[PDB]
Design a protein around this ligand. Structure first.
Ligand SMILES: *[C@@H]1O[C@H](CO)[C@@H](O[C@@H]2O[C@H](CO)[C@@H](O[C@@H]3O[C@H](CO[C@H]4O[C@H](CO)[C@@H](O)[C@H](O[C@H]5O[C@H](CO)[C@@H](O)[C@H](O)[C@@H]5O)[C@@H]4O)[C@@H](O)[C@H](O[C@@H]4O[C@H](CO)[C@@H](O)[C@H](O)[C@@H]4O[C@H]4O[C@H](CO)[C@@H](O)[C@H](O)[C@@H]4O)[C@@H]3O)[C@H](O)[C@H]2NC(C)=O)[C@H](O)[C@H]1NC(C)=O
Ligand SMILES: *[C@@H]1O[C@H](CO)[C@@H](O[C@@H]2O[C@H](CO)[C@@H](O[C@@H]3O[C@H](CO[C@H]4O[C@H](CO)[C@@H](O)[C@H](O[C@H]5O[C@H](CO)[C@@H](O)[C@H](O)[C@@H]5O)[C@@H]4O)[C@@H](O)[C@H](O[C@@H]4O[C@H](CO)[C@@H](O)[C@H](O)[C@@H]4O[C@H]4O[C@H](CO)[C@@H](O)[C@H](O)[C@@H]4O)[C@@H]3O)[C@H](O)[C@H]2NC(C)=O)[C@H](O)[C@H]1NC(C)=O
Ligand SMILES: *[C@@H]1O[C@H](CO)[C@@H](O[C@@H]2O[C@H](CO)[C@@H](O[C@H]3O[C@H](CO)[C@@H](O)[C@H](O[C@H]4O[C@H](CO)[C@@H](O)[C@H](O)[C@@H]4O[C@H]4O[C@H](CO)[C@@H](O)[C@H](O)[C@@H]4O[C@H]4O[C@H](CO)[C@@H](O)[C@H](O)[C@@H]4O)[C@@H]3O)[C@H](O)[C@H]2NC(C)=O)[C@H](O)[C@H]1NC(C)=O
Ligand SMILES: *[C@@H]1O[C@H](CO)[C@@H](O[C@@H]2O[C@H](CO)[C@@H](O[C@H]3O[C@H](CO)[C@@H](O)[C@H](O[C@H]4O[C@H](CO)[C@@H](O)[C@H](O)[C@@H]4O[C@H]4O[C@H](CO)[C@@H](O)[C@H](O)[C@@H]4O)[C@@H]3O)[C@H](O)[C@H]2NC(C)=O)[C@H](O)[C@H]1NC(C)=O
Ligand SMILES: *[C@@H]1O[C@H](CO)[C@@H](O[C@@H]2O[C@H](CO)[C@@H](O[C@@H]3O[C@H](CO)[C@@H](O)[C@H](O)[C@@H]3O)[C@H](O)[C@H]2NC(C)=O)[C@H](O)[C@H]1NC(C)=O
Ligand SMILES: *[C@@H]1O[C@H](CO)[C@@H](O[C@@H]2O[C@H](CO)[C@@H](O[C@@H]3O[C@H](CO)[C@@H](O)[C@H](O)[C@@H]3O)[C@H](O)[C@H]2NC(C)=O)[C@H](O)[C@H]1NC(C)=O
Ligand SMILES: *[C@@H]1O[C@H](CO)[C@@H](O)[C@H](O)[C@H]1NC(C)=O
Ligand SMILES: *[C@@H]1O[C@H](CO)[C@@H](O)[C@H](O)[C@H]1NC(C)=O
Ligand SMILES: *[C@@H]1O[C@H](CO)[C@@H](O)[C@H](O)[C@H]1NC(C)=O
Ligand SMILES: *[C@@H]1O[C@H](CO)[C@@H](O)[C@H](O)[C@H]1NC(C)=O
Ligand SMILES: *[C@@H]1O[C@H](CO)[C@@H](O)[C@H](O)[C@H]1NC(C)=O
Ligand SMILES: *[C@@H]1O[C@H](CO)[C@@H](O)[C@H](O)[C@H]1NC(C)=O
Ligand SMILES: OC[C@H]1O[C@@H](O)[C@@H](O)[C@@H](O)[C@@H]1O
Ligand SMILES: OC[C@@H](O)[C@H](O)[C@@H](O)CO
Ligand SMILES: OC[C@H]1O[C@@H](O)[C@H](O)[C@H]1O
Lengths: 757, 758
């Protein structure tokens, strides 16, 4: 129903496309099928070579915190954790660092970053942590910078997952072992998404990935309107490849492809894993595609366009003239692949300190009745296995960080489970960072780290230790992983119990939370014995040494929440995860654009901590809001260009031009130096519009007491537009826009009204 | 009475302290005498009653031999065992001086330390052997001297313990009487039946050195000797200790060491402890009862004045009247026995952490090295054992005596043993922490499996998947033991056996580190070529990791040596080392005589695995040029107190402790690295049934460079070359050929020569 436009190279890949075209033009049918389907190798996936032309096997490798399965590398903080920095410089630098390590391990294509699938419709999503903000605008800037940093290191990106992949449950990878297939049991969950919602929420971050020059995009496991993502013509050929003007390849999820012919006709470029994983995740092209070309049902012109999309990245990143080194680790594992591993160390100086700065910039202060910052306390108590090592080793949970037992004390939660985890060379534990600082103050320190419910004597030891401590730290965690959603907000392990004991025996409890998402702390958050509360997300290998300096006030906290923290799972979008045994499971996105905070705002629900909330050790006062209509500029800077239709198109201009700039002033009005994330929210007029939508942020660094700084927010045409289902285009409405500036999504003291002319 | 109580006279250094003590005691009522000589209730292990009228406060008596126990704000020092392994006199003294400063700043008058030859080492299974030092009278004696000296130099009176022949914990049998039913109705204490020669040449040796250093008090033991209780043994206390050793200080009971009012008063006891403390459950035989014994004529008032004078001598000698200790603020008894709140004081001084670390670095003993040590810069490191990290319940979770955690709990690094000799910790620097630190400096990876390998799901699989790819795997092992029990055998604590099976199965470069209270069984793996090195680190206190890692990486070469013998089997030691019996009067017959630890091995031609005095370095040393200088003698001027030990060569001017000659030898560093060497001297004294050889000297040369030489020197005292004549009741230098041997261990003695006296 929607025809596949041919690739032409767009803006920045013109010469790379031309080499890709000339190379493909000399290929046999048997060669075209080789490069478009996966083969057996050491990496997550591997394209077939075209050996007659000197095109090698491309190594495709997970994942969104760095190369997975690999020794000799670093464990970076997750996307969640960089999001909470609200710092553009760090978002870029992390991706550049990941890229360096991908390149040096010999990866051609990184299966990274996550750029808005999952976006955040449900805060229970098992792999929400792999992405960044539950907000299209901020997820969009984060995705732009993440793709830029990876591509600038010389690795091709595969941005994922396209699209509306918002729950793990019933995602239902294609699996066929013993002749019984997943198709005989249950189809994938189907996101039924209206067109306005697709344009204004889910496509937004992908447009940014495309503009930043993402080389490839991964389709998703879910169906959309009862059509598989990997063979959805409206999705791939029309929305992605026509409207977003995407010039790269679509890569299948591993078990994302369910058929041979529709996938070919409808926009898929690469079948993965192909012959990897014994063929059990389907092997629908390869020789079957040769047959389909030669027997006439799939055209050779169509398949050539797939190969050109694959080769465009190869030539634009200069992998022909500067090939990556060889890839030496078996990341698949026996019995699936029998193959020894080499060894390579790629950790560069500077990487560890970068990982620590992202942790120190993201730790988010939620409550502080005056216990923080610490001074030089003499007697410190520490609770929870989250304060120390996994008792079986940092990497004991295996190549996907998901094979340890349900009750294992996994230690500090530095990453989540699944394809987006990575190995850690060590873990810097909160306990050891705390002890180091205790020794400097000549203090004492003791930690109870066992399970408080099941270890003989643990409850007594807690009761004897806590009453004489000046401060007691409670470390809590909540592991989640790809493949399942969290059943609710409950804390992991014995957390509930550690809290019940902590508040019973101590009056100065400081809680620290390592987590993949929102958790339930309602029983304790208003207890006056809990004097402070911090969420550190998934900080990677520098867990303790990033946190402790914030606790002791060497650096004031400046992280803010990148999603909403509701009091109950009941306060979020209804039917966040659908559980059914129907053969055709359905998820209807009837909420439309109202997910996360925009659902809270429209329903008049008050969260415990709102989107964009974080405390500091000082306070900031906002003043002098200026809307400068004189400060406009053409968009010149993008790597690639969309073909997104809009009403004000004149043949030269762009949906992404800056049409005006907004300024405000902040003043440090407390007693310490501190950083501040300023945020700008826009109320677009129209019917059934979000109360307010984030459209800017700007983080001021280390503003001294009594000093002032100007904060600046460039507003693009698209930032102030709506999508017209009837006209099929973006337009700026006439009407009153409200513009608000402040320190969180509910704390906005500056406001003004803009009416277009 | 056959053995009468001599009166105190103040001896050499306590003359004026004795006169102030006598001044005060002379003014005392019978009620006041009885108050100061018996324990009362308070915050410390024991408290003497005040003499309120004369301004004598309560004296705080506080455990223990690693520093003040049950107390926050202090440091956890290494155990005696550990400092013995240094063979370093300087560290022996400095350790006790620091414990001293901490005792004193915490408010302590009398420290229940050090342990100076009870237990000595008759059995390597003794649950509290680790509190002491060497299994050898000479070396124990030198360490006791210097420990008493350090503690008394700091301002705390010492109570050296345990007199005497207290060589097993089993059936030590404290006196306990509660609800009308007493330990006397169940079983008497084990009886150490010791002949006179053995008492003089073995068990009294360390105690004579403790006396000469000015130990202010001595504690008697739980054992009976020849079926008479130590705390009321007249031959023991009045004759051997107060007459022959000329002891001028007080005798304090063990807690539950006193079994009677009257014989104890007559036969040498000076202080009853704990008295009214511990609910009077441990006996309370004096107090009001002694007041009655004096008033009604059974016990002489003058005997009791002597006891008070002995107590007060220390108070005045150490200047506790003009420089009182500050108040003692911690409840170290525990609820429900004592319901009282604790204050807080911090006495940790800069410098103390480094000293503790230095003792650890100097004691770690290298027993095997096929090439794997020192490490260079390994890139992938595996670590096994909960001994590598924290007690999962907290460093102090095991309570005020380090003995109240479950039999199966993961106690983390064994930094001290259990019982009255332990102490709390402000933190523990774990081996894993310190290794990680070094791993990060080298851009390496590191991973530890620290769960119980037998009983945690997935633990054996994690060990199997982690080990094969490591460049080096460290396995940490431990063996807790405590006061009140003897170890049943040499087996490793916890899952040690299983961790060793796994480690040699999956790795070819295993380095084993043992934290232990004594010898353990590693026969199954010590000869496995995959075990490329083995170190024993004893009980290193709070600086466990950071004392160890610099040795392993070669910043410092190891220089510790075993302070006891490591046999292949328990069956190779002195038989009947621990007696087990339900007889009412259990007997232990010391029929081996002076032949314990290495003298037993040497006499019976038994080859130990690792001998007494053994320890490798990262370099080798060559011995040469043995010289016996008969002209380098000197009179003993410098002891704090004098014994009255009779000897045949007495002329009115001279001493048993004169140096009569001096021996010299030369070491040369003959390998490729700088290193320190502990040189040792052994003498074969001629006569009937004499040890093959006996340690009589040691000297540690620090940081000898490659190709350099240094002279080692061994002053030989008259007593070092004497025997006890049972017939004549005196020490004498026998006629005959004495062989003098010098070298690097008790079985690596390349230089020898012969000395003949007439
Ligand atoms: C998954 O399923 C959903 C549900 O069906 C699919 O959404 C649909 O996507 C379609 C595009 O692929 C949309 O088609 C357009 O519909 C326009 C008319 O819109 C009304 O029609 C129906 C009437 O029964 C109604 O559903 C719509 O109501 C929704 O929107 C309004 C407003 O926000 C709300 O009030 C309602 O709640 C509903 O949510 C609308 O009221 C139609 O004008 C439009 O026109 C064409 O555009 C094309 C392509 O460029 C062109 O060929 C045609 O010529 C025509 O354009 C012409 O007209 C305009 C002038 O009017 C001119 O500018 C042009 O240049 C040209 O001359 C188009 O057909 C469909 O409405 C939308 N439905 C919903 C409910 O969202 C979703 O895409 C599926 N996704 C996937 C991945 O499959
Ligand atoms: C625990 O039980 C043990 C076992 O009973 C107690 O040991 C005993 O300690 C006694 C001292 O309290 C020793 O007494 C001396 O014995 C001398 C005689 O030695 C022989 O006699 C008996 C024969 O039946 C025998 O036990 C001994 O055999 C042992 O030793 C030899 C030699 O090494 C070995 O071959 C054997 O295998 C045995 O181990 C002996 O063969 C005796 O000369 C000595 O002399 C007196 O000293 C006192 C006090 O100062 C004095 O009153 C006397 O007049 C006399 O000395 C005078 O003369 C000398 C010169 O002759 C002069 O220099 C003096 O100044 C003075 O003018 C004394 O009676 C007893 O031998 C010993 N037994 C054993 C087996 O060791 C042990 O002490 C008990 N411990 C406790 C804490 O109670
Ligand atoms: C240390 O780190 C360890 C890992 O290294 C942690 O261990 C892992 O912990 C996770 C939980 O965090 C654990 O999760 C699985 O537990 C069992 C597996 O036996 C399953 O119940 C879980 O999946 C279900 O539960 C979810 C919530 O209720 C749900 O989101 C999910 O999708 C799934 O539910 C389906 O299954 C049920 C029927 O059987 C239905 O009720 C439900 O509707 C769902 O139906 C759908 O799927 C069915 C097929 O699966 C299908 O038939 C149906 O029609 C429909 O499609 C969950 O994965 C891991 O097992 C555990 N790992 C191991 C190895 O034990 C550890 O906890 C951590 N420690 C600490 C202290 O945190
Ligand atoms: C972690 O730390 C904790 C302490 O904080 C350690 O736990 C303690 O470990 C000790 C082992 O070293 C435990 O010792 C006792 O075990 C039982 C208790 O019921 C007891 O029978 C034993 O004493 C007897 O055995 C030996 C040898 O056979 C004798 O020397 C001793 O005198 C006792 O025998 C007597 O009784 C027998 C008749 O009943 C008779 O055969 C004999 O004749 C003899 O007279 C030990 O006392 C200790 O209980 C344990 N503590 C607690 C509170 O549970 C823990 O092990 C450390 N963890 C690790 C992994 O090492
Ligand atoms: C279809 O794709 C497959 C899989 O990539 C192509 O087979 C593979 O061809 C490559 C050469 O491009 C072989 O790798 C080379 O191996 C040699 C020595 O064994 C080595 O020295 C080179 O550096 C290089 O790595 C690879 O082994 C081979 N694998 C298999 C299973 O055959 C195949 O040729 C493609 N077909 C066409 C028509 O291009
Ligand atoms: C026999 O010993 C008992 C116990 O030592 C003596 O009673 C105690 O006497 C002391 C004074 O020497 C009292 O201590 C003081 O307490 C006050 C607080 O009330 C404080 O101001 C002082 O600094 C000091 O600590 C203590 O109250 C008291 N204890 C008991 C249990 O009564 C008794 O005096 C002695 N008998 C004779 C005859 O000397
Ligand atoms: C073309 O070949 C394919 C692949 O095997 C086969 O399934 C299909 O039916 C063929 N078409 C015709 C018209 O024979
Ligand atoms: C707060 O802690 C104290 C002990 O420090 C406890 O007794 C009190 O009940 C606690 N209060 C609450 C509300 O949990
Ligand atoms: C999804 O929506 C259609 C809309 O008309 C409805 O019939 C269906 O029941 C809805 N939900 C499910 C889970 O089927
Ligand atoms: C003296 O007093 C003691 C202790 O109360 C008593 O048991 C003993 O029988 C008395 N002795 C005489 C001879 O009265
Ligand atoms: C030494 O370790 C290897 C594994 O590295 C194992 O195969 C071998 O059997 C071990 N050797 C012995 C003697 O235990
Ligand atoms: C101990 O010694 C004597 C020999 O002098 C003997 O009567 C007794 O039976 C021995 N006891 C044991 C238990 O060996
Ligand atoms: O608890 C003391 C134990 O040791 C001693 C034995 O003789 C027994 O009475 C008991 O089993
Ligand atoms: O397991 C889910 C992941 O998305 C996989 O499909 C691939 O490794 C690509 O990320
Ligand atoms: O020093 C006090 C303790 O020493 C040991 O002898 C006993 O447990 C107590 O007496």
């Amino acid at each position: 129903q929607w025809p596949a436009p041919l690739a032409n190279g767009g803006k920045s890949w013109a010469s790379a496309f031309k080499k890709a075209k000339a190379t493909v033009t000399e290929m046999t049918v048997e060669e075209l099928a080789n490069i478009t389907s996966g083969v057996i190798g050491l990496c997550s996936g591997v394209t077939g070579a075209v050996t007659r032309l000197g095109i090698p096997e491309f190594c495709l490798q997970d994942g969104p915190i760095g190369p997975r399965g690999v020794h000799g590398s670093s464990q970076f903080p997750a996307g969640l954790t960089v999001a909470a920095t609200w710092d553009r410089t760090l978002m870029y630098a992390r991706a550049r660092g990941m890229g360096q390590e991908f390149h040096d391990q010999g990866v051609h294509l990184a299966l990274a970053p996550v750029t808005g699938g999952p976006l955040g419709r449900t805060p229970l999503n098992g792999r929400g942590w792999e992405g960044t903000f539950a907000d299209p605008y901020a997820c969009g800037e984060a995705s732009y910078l993440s793709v830029k940093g990876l591509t600038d290191a010389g690795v091709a990106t595969v941005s994922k997952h396209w699209i509306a992949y918002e729950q793990e449950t019933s995602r239902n990878l294609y699996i066929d072992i013993d002749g019984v297939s997943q198709a005989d049991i249950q189809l994938p969950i189907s996101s039924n998404v209206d067109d306005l919602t697709m344009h204004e929420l889910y496509m937004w971050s992908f447009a940014e990935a495309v503009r930043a020059g993402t080389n490839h995009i991964m389709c998703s496991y879910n169906r959309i309107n009862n059509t598989h993502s990997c063979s959805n013509a409206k999705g791939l050929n029309q929305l992605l490849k026509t409207e977003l003007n995407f010039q790269g390849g679509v890569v299948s999820n591993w078990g994302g492809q369910w058929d041979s012919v529709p996938a070919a006709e409808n926009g898929l470029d690469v079948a993965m894993p192909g012959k990897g994983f014994l063929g059990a995740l389907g092997d629908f092209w390869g020789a079957t595609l040769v047959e389909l070309i030669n027997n006439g049902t799939v055209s050779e012109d169509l398949v050539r366009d797939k190969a050109v999309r694959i080769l465009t990245g190869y030539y634009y990143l200069g992998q022909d003239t500067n090939p990556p080194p060889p890839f030496v680790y078996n990341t698949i594992g026996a019995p699936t692949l029998n193959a020894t591993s080499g060894y390579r160390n790629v950790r560069k100086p500077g990487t560890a300190e970068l990982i620590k700065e992202i942790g120190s910039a993201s730790v988010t202060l939620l409550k502080n009745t005056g216990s923080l910052p610490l001074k030089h306390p003499q007697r410190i108590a520490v609770l929870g296995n989250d304060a120390t090592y996994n008792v079986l080793g940092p990497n004991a949970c295996g190549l996907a960080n998901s094979a340890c037992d349900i009750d294992n004390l996994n230690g500090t939660l530095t990453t989540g489970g699944g394809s987006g985890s990575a190995l850690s060379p060590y873990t810097i534990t909160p306990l050891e960072a705390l002890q180091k600082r205790a020794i400097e103050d000549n203090a004492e320190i003791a930690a109870v780290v066992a399970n408080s419910n099941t270890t003989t004597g643990a409850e007594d030891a807690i009761a004897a230790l806590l009453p004489d401590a000046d401060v007691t730290f409670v470390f809590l965690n909540r592991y989640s992983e790809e493949g399942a959603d969290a059943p609710d907000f409950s804390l992991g392990g014995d957390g509930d119990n550690l809290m019940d004991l902590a508040v019973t025996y101590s009056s100065n409890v400081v809680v620290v939370i390592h987590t993949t998402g929102v958790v339930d702390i309602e029983k304790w958050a208003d207890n006056p014995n809990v004097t402070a509360i911090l969420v550190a997300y998934l900080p990677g290998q520098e867990a303790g040494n990033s946190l402790v300096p914030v606790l002791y006030g060497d650096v004031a906290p400046s992280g803010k929440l990148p999603w909403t923290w509701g009091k109950s799972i009941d306060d979020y979008v209804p039917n966040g995860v659908v559980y059914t045994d129907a053969y055709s499971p359905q998820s209807n996105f009837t909420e439309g654009v109202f997910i996360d905070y925009r659902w809270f705002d429209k329903m008049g629900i008050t969260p415990r901590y709102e989107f964009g909330f974080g405390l500091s050790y000082t306070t900031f006062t906002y003043s002098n809001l200026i809307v400068d209509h004189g400060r406009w500029a053409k968009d010149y800077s993008s790597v690639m260009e969309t073909a997104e239709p809009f009403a004000e198109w004149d043949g030269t201009n762009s949906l992404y031009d800056v049409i005006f700039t907004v300024f405000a002033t902040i003043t440090n009005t407390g007693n310490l130096t501190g950083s501040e994330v300023a945020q700008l929210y826009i109320s677009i007029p129209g019917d059934n519009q979000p109360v307010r939508q984030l459209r800017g942020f700007d983080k001021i660094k280390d503003l001294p007491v009594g000093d002032s700084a100007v904060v600046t927010f460039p507003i693009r045409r698209k930032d102030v537009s709506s999508w017209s289902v009837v006209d099929q285009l973006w337009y700026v409405p006439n009407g009153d826009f409200l513009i608000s500036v402040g320190g969180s999504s509910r704390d906005l003291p500056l406001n003004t009204t803009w009416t277009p002319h």
